[PDB]
Structures are given as structure tokens and as C-alpha cells.
């Protein structure tokens, strides 16, 4: 009941490190299929991201 | 109150004006006619990633929402896993620092990772291997987390054993 | 301008096709050269050291 | 925080001590989980190329993670090898089948590496004459014969590396393990 829940908080560690990655890096190839999809021939797109923290 | 940091993608083309500010740039739109500052403005780098094809452009489309939706179900239940174990707080501190450092620097410094993926390959090949790895990644998050609930099972009957 | 539009999605689309075909073709030919000069020089390294000996 | 193996009662094997030192550079979610496993060997596999290559079956389905590693000892003990994250087996001539993640390493009782560099992607390479590891202009950085006789390392930019074997032009072989995790 130690040993083990050490090595769950490494593995879920470096799983929420990894996992994260791949997820914001299938969300930045969905905007980019959009926009083309969307949009026309050439990438000039303005990908920004705007944080509105409060209730907004 | 709940103090969020959530964030909004967006992309626009390169001659994106405001018609309801005629003559004013995004980027001040962004600074001083914003909601009153409370966001940050961001960009996001995206590398070209070669086409595969128009035609297929839909069904890519429609099984990247499908894949979308796994990899979030299937993180949620990692968070759950987490928050749940004490493994983080319950109330904040949901997300942890990435290479030691934080999520909202990570993203505002996003990169593509060419270490591991590269972008000589197709789409289809590339949504392929990344739904694999996810596939990979969740099971083994899985299967450790039913051995550590086998674990403590036994603790507690362990525990059990002793009273009575 | 309706069949301008397909046309040049077609012209993007086949610009795309050969670049990409060209890049990849670029890698192939000094991978191959890579390899095969290095080969070559191995073997004739091998048969210039036994006959040498 | 330890490893593993799985020999059987030959004259020569790995150290741990080696293994614990090797552990230090690899991608993380590998180090974590510890047993490593003896695929193959040329003392108790015998001395052919072609029996390595049908003994490491790429069998990724149970876990595509998986890192190969090939240590091997030069004429004079100078022990050196690399981390592999794909399984080697001949291929046709297109591309080098290889993620920009591996390294090199010279291991003594003195541990050394040279990462992979976003230069090129050179010669991470497999077939059935042969088995190298990143080169460029000049010889391969790694090289083992089809027979397992002689060997060719050299510096070049896929990892700027230095020459590994005590002979360093070209040596020869005298024992040669494989650890896959």
C-alpha cells in the first residue's frame, strides 16, 4: 500500500504530462482543418488563444 | 467564487479588421477594447502540416471529433483518478506543471513536438499512431489503477483479519 | 468565377502533390547517397585491405 | 528504483550496475517500470544475423512503448551500444524507420552519450547485410557485419558522437547481447 501508491503517482504523473501533450496536439490539428476547411488556399490564419478567467 | 483559467482557440484570416471598430488593428482590439483586460493574448504556432486530401477532409474531420471526445472522456477519468487518490487538490491546482513549468506558459509557448512526431507523414497516418498511443497510455493508466484498488482491497481486508 | 474556384483548389492541390513529391524524393536521393557511397566505400575498403594483405 | 534479467546459466551477461547507470537517459513512462528482458544473445542464439533478426520478432502490439537496447563489447572490453525505440528488421530502401529519440553511449566500470540532433535522420537503418546506426559524410556511426565479425564507428551529425570502439576505424566482435523494455 505504499510501494504501489508511489509508483501510481509516477505513472499518473508522467501520464497527465504526456496525455496533455497529445490532447492540446490533436486540438491544434482540429483548428488547423477547420481553418482550412473554412477558409481558402493559402495559411495566413491568426491562431490565438483569449482567457477569460471570471464567470465571462 | 471560482477563480477559472480556461482558454478559448480561435484563428481568423490575415486580413481580420473590426467592423464595429473600423481603422483599429486586432491586437489593440485584443489590449484596450477588450473585455477590460482580464484576458491575455496568446498565439498559437501551427507547423504546415501537408494536406492529405479535400475530399476526405470531412470524414478526417467527423473521426477527429470522435477522437477528440475519447482522449477528453478518457483524461477526465484520469483527473477523477487523480483528484479522487489525493493525488492533487481537489479544489485548484487540477493541471500540473508541465516540464516543471506551468500549463498556461506551456501553451502560450506551445510547440510542436518533432522529437517524437514528424510531419513528413500524412494525416491519416499521423491520427493513426497518436489514437494508438492514446489507446496504449490509457490502458496501462487503467490497469495500474485497478491493481492499486486490488491493493488497498487487500489492505482493507488485511485490516479486517486483524479485528473482529 | 464558379469553376475558378474548384480550379484553383485543383492547382493547390496539385502544387501540393508536387513539392511534397519533390521533398521527399530530395530525402530519398541523399539517404540513398548516404547509404550507398558509404557501402560502396566499405566494400572497396575491404577488398583494397585483402588484397593489400 | 532496480532492474532485472533473465539469463540462462551462460559464461557471460550484463551488470546491473551497468543497467542502473544506462537507466539514467531514456524517455520517461520507460524508466518507471523495471524488468528487463534478454531477446537476444550470440552466445546461447548463435553467431547469425539472421537468427537476431527472426529472434526479435517486432511484436509492439503489447506495448508499442517499448525500448530496445544493444550493448556490445569490442576486441579489448571497450563495452559501448545504443537505444532503440523500434525493432530491427530489413526493410525496403524508401525511408530510415526511426524516431528522433534515440542515442549512443561508451559504458565502463564512465558512463557517456551523445542524444539525438535535429541535424538529420541518417542511417537508422536495417537490412538484411547490415545494421547502422546515424551517419552521414564518412562511415556510419555504428556498423555490425551480416556475419558479426567486424564493426566500422565514426562521428556524424545525426549524433555528433564520438568513435566509440577501442579500434575505432574498424574492430571486431566478441560478444554481443540485446535488452528489450
Given at each position: 500500500?505504499?510501494?504501489?501508491?508511489?509508483?501510481?503517482?509516477?505513472?499518473?504523473?508522467?501520464?497527465?504530462?504526456?496525455?496533455?501533450?497529445?490532447?492540446?496536439?490533436?486540438?491544434?490539428?482540429?483548428?488547423?482543418?477547420?481553418?482550412?476547411?473554412?477558409?481558402?488556399?493559402?495559411?495566413?490564419?491568426?491562431?490565438?488563444?483569449?482567457?477569460?478567467?471570471?464567470?465571462? | 467564487?471560482?477563480?477559472?483559467?480556461?482558454?478559448?482557440?480561435?484563428?481568423?484570416?490575415?486580413?481580420?479588421?473590426?467592423?464595429?471598430?473600423?481603422?483599429?488593428?486586432?491586437?489593440?482590439?485584443?489590449?484596450?477594447?477588450?473585455?477590460?483586460?482580464?484576458?491575455?493574448?496568446?498565439?498559437?504556432?501551427?507547423?504546415?502540416?501537408?494536406?492529405?486530401?479535400?475530399?476526405?477532409?470531412?470524414?478526417?474531420?467527423?473521426?477527429?471529433?470522435?477522437?477528440?471526445?475519447?482522449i477528453g472522456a478518457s483524461i477526465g477519468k484520469i483527473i477523477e483518478i487523480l483528484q479522487g487518490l489525493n493525488e492533487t487538490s481537489t479544489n485548484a491546482y487540477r493541471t500540473l506543471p508541465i516540464n516543471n513549468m506551468p500549463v498556461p506558459e506551456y501553451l502560450e509557448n506551445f510547440q510542436?513536438?518533432?522529437?517524437?512526431?514528424?510531419?513528413?507523414?500524412?494525416?491519416?497516418?499521423?491520427?493513426?499512431?497518436?489514437?494508438?498511443?492514446?489507446?496504449?497510455?490509457?490502458?496501462?493508466?487503467?490497469?495500474?489503477?485497478?491493481?492499486?484498488?486490488?491493493?488497498?482491497?487487500?489492505?482493507?481486508?488485511?485490516?479486517?483479519?486483524?479485528?473482529? | 468565377?464558379?469553376?475558378?474556384?474548384?480550379?484553383?483548389?485543383?492547382?493547390?492541390?496539385?502544387?501540393?502533390?508536387?513539392?511534397?513529391?519533390?521533398?521527399?524524393?530530395?530525402?530519398?536521393?541523399?539517404?540513398?547517397?548516404?547509404?550507398?557511397?558509404?557501402?560502396?566505400?566499405?566494400?572497396?575498403?575491404?577488398?583494397?585491405?585483402?588484397?593489400?594483405? | 528504483?532496480?532492474?532485472?534479467?533473465?539469463?540462462?546459466?551462460?559464461?557471460?551477461?550484463?551488470?546491473?550496475?551497468?543497467?542502473?547507470?544506462?537507466?539514467?537517459?531514456?524517455?520517461?513512462?520507460?524508466?518507471?517500470?523495471?524488468?528487463?528482458?534478454?531477446?537476444?544473445?550470440?552466445?546461447?542464439?548463435?553467431?547469425?544475423?539472421?537468427?537476431?533478426?527472426?529472434?526479435?520478432?517486432?511484436?509492439?502490439?503489447?506495448?508499442?512503448?517499448?525500448?530496445?537496447?544493444?550493448?556490445?563489447?569490442?576486441?579489448?572490453?571497450?563495452?559501448?551500444?545504443?537505444?532503440?525505440?523500434?525493432?530491427?528488421?530489413?526493410?525496403?530502401?524508401?525511408?530510415?524507420?526511426?524516431?528522433?529519440?534515440?542515442?549512443?553511449?561508451?559504458?565502463?566500470?564512465?558512463?557517456?552519450?551523445?542524444?539525438?540532433?535535429?541535424?538529420?535522420?541518417?542511417?537508422?537503418?536495417?537490412?538484411?547485410?547490415?545494421?547502422?546506426?546515424?551517419?552521414?559524410?564518412?562511415?556510419?556511426?555504428?556498423?555490425?557485419?551480416?556475419?558479426?565479425?567486424?564493426?566500422?564507428?565514426?562521428?556524424?551529425?545525426?549524433?555528433?558522437?564520438?568513435?566509440?570502439?577501442?579500434?575505432?576505424?574498424?574492430?571486431?566482435?566478441?560478444?554481443?547481447?540485446?535488452?528489450?523494455?
Amino acid at each position: 500500500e505504499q510501494s504501489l501508491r508511489v509508483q501510481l503517482v509516477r505513472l499518473a504523473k508522467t501520464a497527465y504530462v504526456d496525455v496533455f501533450i497529445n490532447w492540446f496536439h490533436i486540438k491544434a490539428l482540429r483548428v488547423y482543418v477547420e481553418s482550412v476547411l473554412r477558409y481558402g488556399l493559402p495559411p495566413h490564419f491568426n491562431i490565438k488563444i483569449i482567457a477569460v478567467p471570471p464567470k465571462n | 467564487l471560482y477563480t477559472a483559467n480556461d482558454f478559448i482557440l480561435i484563428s481568423l484570416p490575415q486580413n481580420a479588421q473590426p467592423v464595429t471598430a473600423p481603422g483599429s488593428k486586432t491586437d489593440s482590439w485584443f489590449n484596450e477594447t477588450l473585455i477590460g483586460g482580464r484576458a491575455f493574448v496568446s498565439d498559437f504556432k501551427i507547423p504546415e502540416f501537408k494536406i492529405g486530401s479535400l475530399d476526405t477532409l470531412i470524414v478526417e474531420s467527423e473521426e477527429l471529433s470522435k477522437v477528440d471526445n475519447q482522449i477528453g472522456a478518457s483524461i477526465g477519468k484520469i483527473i477523477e483518478i487523480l483528484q479522487g487518490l489525493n493525488e492533487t487538490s481537489t479544489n485548484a491546482y487540477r493541471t500540473l506543471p508541465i516540464n516543471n513549468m506551468p500549463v498556461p506558459e506551456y501553451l502560450e509557448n506551445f510547440q510542436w513536438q518533432t522529437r517524437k512526431f514528424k510531419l513528413d507523414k500524412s494525416i491519416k497516418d499521423l491520427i493513426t499512431l497518436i489514437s494508438n498511443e492514446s489507446s496504449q497510455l490509457d490502458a496501462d493508466v487503467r490497469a495500474t489503477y485497478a491493481n492499486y484498488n486490488s491493493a488497498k482491497t487487500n489492505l482493507a481486508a488485511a485490516e479486517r483479519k486483524k479485528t473482529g | 468565377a464558379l469553376t475558378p474556384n474548384q480550379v484553383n483548389d485543383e492547382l493547390n492541390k496539385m502544387q501540393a502533390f508536387i513539392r511534397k513529391e519533390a521533398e521527399e524524393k530530395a530525402k530519398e536521393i541523399q539517404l540513398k547517397a548516404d547509404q550507398e557511397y558509404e557501402i560502396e566505400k566499405t566494400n572497396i575498403v575491404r577488398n583494397e585491405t585483402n588484397n593489400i594483405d | 528504483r532496480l532492474n532485472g534479467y533473465l539469463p540462462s546459466t551462460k559464461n557471460k551477461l550484463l551488470t546491473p550496475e551497468m543497467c542502473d547507470e544506462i537507466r539514467t537517459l531514456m524517455p520517461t513512462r520507460i524508466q518507471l517500470y523495471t524488468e528487463w528482458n534478454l531477446l537476444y544473445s550470440l552466445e546461447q542464439h548463435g553467431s547469425s544475423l539472421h537468427s537476431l533478426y527472426s529472434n526479435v520478432a517486432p511484436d509492439s502490439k503489447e506495448f508499442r512503448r517499448v525500448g530496445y537496447v544493444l550493448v556490445i563489447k569490442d576486441r579489448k572490453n571497450g563495452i559501448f551500444g545504443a537505444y532503440s525505440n523500434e525493432a530491427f528488421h530489413p526493410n525496403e530502401h524508401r525511408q530510415y524507420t526511426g524516431n528522433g529519440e534515440c542515442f549512443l553511449w561508451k559504458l565502463d566500470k564512465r558512463f557517456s552519450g551523445y542524444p539525438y540532433t535535429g541535424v538529420n535522420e541518417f542511417a537508422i537503418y536495417c537490412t538484411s547485410e547490415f545494421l547502422s546506426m546515424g551517419a552521414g559524410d564518412g562511415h556510419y556511426g555504428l556498423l555490425c557485419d551480416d556475419g558479426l565479425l567486424h564493426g566500422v564507428s565514426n562521428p556524424c551529425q545525426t549524433y555528433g558522437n564520438e568513435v566509440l570502439s577501442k579500434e575505432g576505424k574498424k574492430f571486431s566482435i566478441v560478444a554481443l547481447e540485446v535488452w528489450r523494455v
